[PDB]
Design a binder for this molecule. Structure first.
Ligand SMILES: Nc1ncnc2c1ncn2[C@@H]1O[C@H](COP(=O)(O)OP(=O)(O)OP(=O)(O)O)[C@@H](O)[C@H]1O
Ligand SMILES: Nc1ncnc2c1ncn2[C@@H]1O[C@H](COP(=O)(O)OP(=O)(O)O)[C@@H](O)[C@H]1O
Ligand SMILES: [Mg+2]
Ligand SMILES: [Mg+2]
Lengths: 489, 463, 48, 463, 129, 129
């Protein structure tokens, strides 16, 4: 009887159990009908639990028993190219998953002495990101923006860009329509990115307890390669929906509210998850694998997504998370409707890792181009009230316009490191000063086409190794000078 | 097996049952003798079920008997419901006799799984030029209707019903969530006059009913539309069905009122803690399945003109297109009065609808925007002091504005002009030709309320 | 006269933009006030 | 006697004891068969004490056993903690072996009395242009950094560590109370490879830990700093300790997270009813008595970017110098984004800093405040609808705003420009010249991140 | 024809009774069903058909139709029409008549604000001339 | 002459003590009997006639009058004098002195806001000159 209990109350997907004198905190609980729950609080007389499934089939007076194991999910290399729900059960109808290991869903990040500084870059294909907001293996960067602004496109492009790098990927969908998930899966399968990707889905009709638990299961699935000297990349499509589900569960549990009716431990809820994405040293890998692999360092990169209301980054949850990650990428509605499709707002978007996660040529060339844009934004906002100004204002405004026109890109169009380096050098050296504000995209597109049709050895040398010296910069200058004349945009 | 009422506080009623046979959540109950019926909402200890009455609690004491149906509320579904008015319980309120249908379906159901979603996104053709060109629909999508009274909302709904029934051999279901009685009577008589009533089934939720009635009235229409979609003829092929909700705002308001009645901690700005889940329950059953499809037209009210309020914020996460009915267009004698610049759609991208359709749509929108930005210049200074390209833009914009209007079937009994069902190709051809500059000599009057493009040519030749 | 034209048009546009920003601020404040009062009332009712 | 767990919820555990063996308040308890330790917070009769676990609740169940140590939590203190990293309970985490010291002090102690308080002392030179003018420091005082998320608290704290802790002879203590773990691994290696680790101590509890750890970490560093302050070598030698406490707001945040579970009625904005008492209890121990001195710098988090929140507002009265960071200034590329207004220091006194310093600071603040009041006329009307004096005020205020920004040694990785250091007299001379009337021809683009004023003059001929 | 002099005071009294009866509060401490209170009262002002009159009178009256008109009155504080009760009642009626304090002082004695006052019935309830 | 440096802190301490005693809160979580708390203290500052002094001292001192002047201090948040404690205390005292943060930064060192400050006693509390 110490492991069996009965249900006394069911309401809104939360079940209070009488009995179960021996059960631990967070342990799995089995109902009749293949329904699993987890404990939440162990009072003096009863036990509380949420249901991971459809609670419409539970009645007062039924039976339950304790499994003896905390929440677990199947982890391994056999999950690549599959679609599962928050518990690891496939839903795509392709058959069972032959797992070999299971891992805990909730755990703690490694300590301070077990970490390493990030120095290996991660490529996404966007000029506005790879030159101003670098991303490195082990760094976590936030994608923040409004509704209908293009947040999901960036994550899918980043996933696609890892075809040759050799790093696994995980995609989590929380509180989304089933049609959108199916479309995303179809698009991933179209480009062959499904061969190294896993998808965890929790739709808008799924219970709040399932949308709450999905990111932790996804992170646990991603940690498998981190612990074994291999890299990975995980995307949470909306952490706002997880916060809303947690708020619903807390309010249904009578916890006192606070700002915007959010309870305490919201910061803890969003912090204990993103703290698990880190780069561990070789000693940690050696200890974990018992000497199976030596001289290897693991990593895990995260790209959470948060949406705002009316472009207000000063709200409670939008700021909480900013105070956790190592940077943010802000997408503005005003620029998106104007025509700037990758609408990246410089000045409000920063990277905390900095230039340590870049190739040498990109790190040296792309120096302080975000602060200039941030200054130019306010200068252009203020300088419409003047009549006569010196040439400094004209030059700064023209340079700002040219740079803001340069960083426009089309979807599904990755750029190599050489193209970014050539374009950034052309912008910095001042060669595009005489070019009109229009035809800037045409100019750099034609320049890249000419530099790829010719100069193939130099371009491939830059692509393989990201170093440059007097010889390479002289070659770049000679090539762009040759292109400037005897060519058409 | 039987129960007995123990508490009566307004609408909330608590019923005590046996040790074992305690009805599940949402299982309807019937009170013996009295007409009223109950619905389960929450289970408490000692075999006590907290319910909500669907009728009225005047004249009810403590100790009456209650019989459990052991099933959710079931409603009659079939072909015999076309042209009949029902309430939330599926009972006729038109004094026309009992419904001949014998089969029933439960109104509580799970959404279709991930494997049942269609493998493509196909457009739905309506025969209206502006809607088909600038705000294309989608099989399984959701459209928000932003418009007040006196602009032709009911006429548009009736026209869409007639168009779908004639073209795609589909049917429709109309659900009124918290509607006025006067407007309901007027709508019924208008449809009966327009010979549209015999291809639509309606459920009415009155404004003076307890919130339990106005909360669960959309699920009845959902169930009827689901039965219509799955009904297979030879070779399956299902059907394409529509669904109208009179106001989605009142649905959330009724949910809030019910949550407040039962007693639970309010969320931000006083809304219920379970809001997004409650709306996703409704909006996840409108999908396109391998057998058929369901499309929804919903009218949305924005409280206090605050787009950041929780209700519109939760509503907009499911909408695929927005139709805006403007009063200036109606006052300018153009029907249907749909704003061509403030109406948006997610399907207007080159990947879904092709390249040339997208190009023509954006070119038309650009011309309209240029005309809008030049109208104030014309007013403030005059038609003169302008070059020729702006004048050409003005003339082409006027031609497009006139061409956006067309006659309707449901107006034949009033004016006598026949209705039109212009297909997408002809609209694309005509607008491409107009943008090219071929029809730069036709008088603008020939483009007004004419329909197609060869009709434009004939009308211009007659003048 | 032409310069006065231009100045007044610019003033109208600036006033419209300021109105929009102030409306956003006011809506946020109103929602916060409603939430705060509801929380206070619920706490007071739970006290007794 | 032995204990018996009876209820586990969140991070709060209550343990039932014998009748005549109830442990006191703040005593530490141990659970047999586990690495978890508890501390007492409340008594409730029946031999029942409410406790907070100094660990994590995994595999914990109702019915375990607990042994009472009958003593508060004690940590190792002395000179052998220099160059070591420890956690809340005082255990090494740097894989370097145990700390070889028997000296241990209780972690809870009373604040010093009124009769052992010391006066102020000399002025601390920092090298920051804006700190040295509008917010002077003082040896033995307290400094606080107020700002929102992503505004630059950590960079400013690291620059302060780099600028004033090198020309110093004495010990130093750094405490992490709920910040990023990545930053904690960069500090250690920088100090290790800069050959300064030999005279520093570290305690780390970060944001990945349960609320028990984040609640009592600051007390450990406080105890170590107190012992370093009170210790005298033979012949009576001082030490002049420095304390660097990271975000204090996380201490109150953990208190808020646990207060409701402890059984306390909520207060305004959901805070705990005993906020001010806890803040004063912790903040009264960071003081310089007559037997030593402590110079401390703290970073304070502002929730939702408003300074009227109950937590930041209570802390304003516990500091001598307050530095306020704004997101507006940060979003304009100005670094450090320190608000010239709203930033005050107690040392801005004509008898402390002199007659010229006070006058220059007052004139600068007056000019900035006068410029601030004109934000509406320029917004609605144009720039031309002002008097010449207002235009001069606006231009001078813009130049002053630009001139308060300088590059940092630490922030070189972000940008690549080398760092700068400015003596106080150069700042005074530059601001005196700017306010006097000269520099009315130099464009404001030459005042951006220059450091001195001769550098401004040199840069004027380039941009 | 029936006129309610102030529904706001009735709402206040109903709130007092509900609060003293320990009903769960909400926005502005109003109970759960405050929209129903006015909806079920204002929906009884209607026009019935000749069949209803014939059936109710059991043939005593033939060829006649009944009616009932309502003119409720509501007071706002500082023109705040966004409050709970004004918004609850505005969405039930078929029109609004707005009286302005500024127009009253300006000399317009009836003080009717045409432009924001509407009638949904419209010209269907007027004589020919 | 007695000066209370901050009555706001006393209000906060009283609120903590009362809330920890489980007494029902109110606006801003302040329980009842706060106006009493800050009114029964200030009411003790007054002037007493010579007869009161003579009776109290049993004739030890004659022809002498006593007095006691109060001077409390209250801190506001962003100039919100519409809060609970400031409104509860303003209606009790016999005058107010307002210090504006805008004038302090401007240059007005004794930043006293005239016009909004008033003294009820008036000219009777001044020397002849
Ligand atoms: N760089 C780009 N160039 C062109 N079109 C783009 C670009 N980025 C996004 N889009 C398009 O803009 C739209 C944005 O949709 P998307 O799914 O990316 O947004 P979202 O932020 O995920 O929105 P939501 O989650 O709120 O539905 C899509 O039609 C997408 O194809
Ligand atoms: N003094 C500074 N100079 C330049 N950049 C800064 C400075 N302070 C902060 N930043 C930028 O802001 C980001 C966050 O820095 P951090 O010191 O962590 O701010 P906070 O601690 O307030 O969040 C960094 O990525 C950095 O680029
Ligand atoms: Mg998206
Ligand atoms: Mg920080």
């Amino acid at each position: 009887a110490k492991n069996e209990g009965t249900i006394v109350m069911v309401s809104d997907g939360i079940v209070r159990i009488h009995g179960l004198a021996d059960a631990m905190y967070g342990e799995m609980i089995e109902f009749d009908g293949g329904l699993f729950g987890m404990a939440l609080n162990l009072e003096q007389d009863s036990v509380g639990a949420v249901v991971l499934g459809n609670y419409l089939s539970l009645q007062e007076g039924q039976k339950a028993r304790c499994t003896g194991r905390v929440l677990e999910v199947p982890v391994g290399p056999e999950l690549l190219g599959r679609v599962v729900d928050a518990l690891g059960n496939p839903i795509d109808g392709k058959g069972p998953i032959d797992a070999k290991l299971t891992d805990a869903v909730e755990k703690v990040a490694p300590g301070v002495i077990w970490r390493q500084s990030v120095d290996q870059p991660v490529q996404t294909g966007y000029k506005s990101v790879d030159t101003m907001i670098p991303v490195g293996r082990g760094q976590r960067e936030l994608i923040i923006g409004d509704r209908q602004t293009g947040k999901t496109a960036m994550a899918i492009d980043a996933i696609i860009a890892q075809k040759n790098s050799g790093i696994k990927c995980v995609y989590v969908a929380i509180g989304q329509k089933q049609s959108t998930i199916a479309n995303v899966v179809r698009k991933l399968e179209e480009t062959g990115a499904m061969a190294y990707t896993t998808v965890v889905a929790a739709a808008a009709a799924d219970p709040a307890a399932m949308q709450y638990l999905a990111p932790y299961s996804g992170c646990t699935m991603g940690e498998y390669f981190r612990d074994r000297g291999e890299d990975a990349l995980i995307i949470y499509d909306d952490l706002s929906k997880q916060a809303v589900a947690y708020r619903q569960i807390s309010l249904l549990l009578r916890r006192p509210p606070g700002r915007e009716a959010y309870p305490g431990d919201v910061f803890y809820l969003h912090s204990r998850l993103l703290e698990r994405a880190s780069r561990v040293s070789a000693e940690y890998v050696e200890k974990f694998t018992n000497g199976a692999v030596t001289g290897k360092t693991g990593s895990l990169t995260a790209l959470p997504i948060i949406e705002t209301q009316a472009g207000d980054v000063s709200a409670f949850v939008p700021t909480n998370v900013i105070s956790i990650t190592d940077g943010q990428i802000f997408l503005e509605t005003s620029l998106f409707n104007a025509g700037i499709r990758p609408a990246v707002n410089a000045g409000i978007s920063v990277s905390r890792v900095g230039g340590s996660a870049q190739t040498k040529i990109i790190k040296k060339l792309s120096g302080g181009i975000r602060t200039a844009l941030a200054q130019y934004r306010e200068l252009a906002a203020f300088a419409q009230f003047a009549s006569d100004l010196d040439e400094a204002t004209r030059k700064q405004l023209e340079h700002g316009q040219r740079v803001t026109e340069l960083m426009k890109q089309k979807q599904y169009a990755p750029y190599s490191i050489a193209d970014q380096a050539v374009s950034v050098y052309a912008s910095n050296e001042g060669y595009m000063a005489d070019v009109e504000v229009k035809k800037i995209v045409d100019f750099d597109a034609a320049l890249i086409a000419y530099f790829r049709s010719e100069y193939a050895p130099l371009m491939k040398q830059i692509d393989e190794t990201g170093d440059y010296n007097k010889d390479i910069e002289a070659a770049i200058k000679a090539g762009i000078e040759s292109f400037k004349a005897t060519q058409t945009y | 097996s039987s129960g007995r009422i123990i508490q009566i506080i307004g609408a909330v009623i608590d019923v005590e049952f046996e040790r074992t046979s305690v009805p599940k959540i949402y299982d309807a109950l019937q009170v013996d003798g009295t007409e009223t019926t109950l619905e389960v909402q929450q289970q408490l200890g000692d075999g006590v079920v907290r319910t909500i009455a669907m009728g009225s609690t005047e004249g009810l004491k403590r100790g009456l008997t209650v019989t459990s149906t052991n099933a959710p509320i079931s409603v009659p579904v079939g072909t015999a419901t076309l042209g009949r008015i029902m309430d939330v319980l599926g009972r006729p309120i038109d004094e026309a006799g009992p419904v001949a249908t014998e089969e029933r379906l439960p109104i509580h159901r799970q959404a279709p799984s991930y494997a049942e979603q269609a493998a493509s996104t196909d457009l739905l053709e309506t025969g209206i030029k502006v809607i088909d060109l600038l705000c294309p629909f989608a099989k399984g999508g959701k459209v928000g209707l932003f418009g007040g009274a006196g602009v032709g909302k009911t006429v548009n709904m009736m026209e869409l019903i007639n168009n779908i029934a004639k073209a795609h051999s589909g049917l429709s279901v109309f659900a009124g969530v918290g509607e006025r009685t006067r407007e309901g009577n007027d709508f019924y008589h208008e449809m009966k006059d327009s010979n549209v009533l015999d291809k639509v089934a309606m459920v009415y939720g009155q404004m003076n009913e307890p919130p339990g009635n106005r909360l669960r009235v959309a699920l009845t229409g959902l169930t009827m539309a689901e039965y219509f979609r799955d009904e297979k003829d030879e070779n399956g092929k299902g059907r394409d069905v529509l669904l109208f909700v009179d106001n989605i705002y009142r649905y959330t308001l009724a949910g809030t009122e019910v949550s407040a009645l039962l007693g639970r901690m309010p969320s931000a700005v006083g809304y219920q803690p379970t809001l997004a889940e409650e709306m996703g329950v409704l909006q996840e059953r409108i999908t396109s399945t391998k057998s058929g499809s369901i499309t929804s037209i919903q009218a949305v009210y924005v409280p206090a003109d605050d787009l950041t309020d929780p209700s519109p914020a939760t509503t907009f996460a499911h909408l695929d297109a927005t139709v805006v009915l403007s009063r200036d267009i109606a006052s300018s004698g153009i029907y249907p009065a749909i704003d061509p610049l403030d109406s948006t759609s997610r399907q207007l991208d080159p990947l879904v609808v092709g390249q040339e359709h997208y190009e023509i749509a954006r070119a038309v929108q650009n011309v309209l925007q240029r005309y809008k930005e030049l109208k104030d210049i014309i007013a403030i200074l005059g038609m003169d002091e302008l070059a020729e390209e702006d004048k050409l833009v003005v003339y082409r914009a006027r031609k497009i504005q006139r061409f956006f209007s067309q006659p309707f079937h449901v107006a034949e009994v009033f004016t006598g002009a026949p209705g039109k069902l212009v297909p997408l190709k002809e609209t694309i051809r005509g607008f491409k030709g107009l943008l090219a500059g071929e029809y730069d000599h036709i008088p603008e009057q020939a483009f007004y309320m004419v329909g197609g493009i060869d009709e434009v040519i004939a009308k211009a030749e007659k003048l | 006269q032409s310069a006065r034209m231009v100045a007044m048009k610019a003033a109208t546009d600036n006033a419209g933009q300021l109105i929009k920003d102030l409306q956003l601020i006011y809506n946020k404040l109103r929602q916060a006030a409603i939430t705060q009062e509801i929380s206070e009332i619920v706490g007071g009712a739970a006290a007794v």
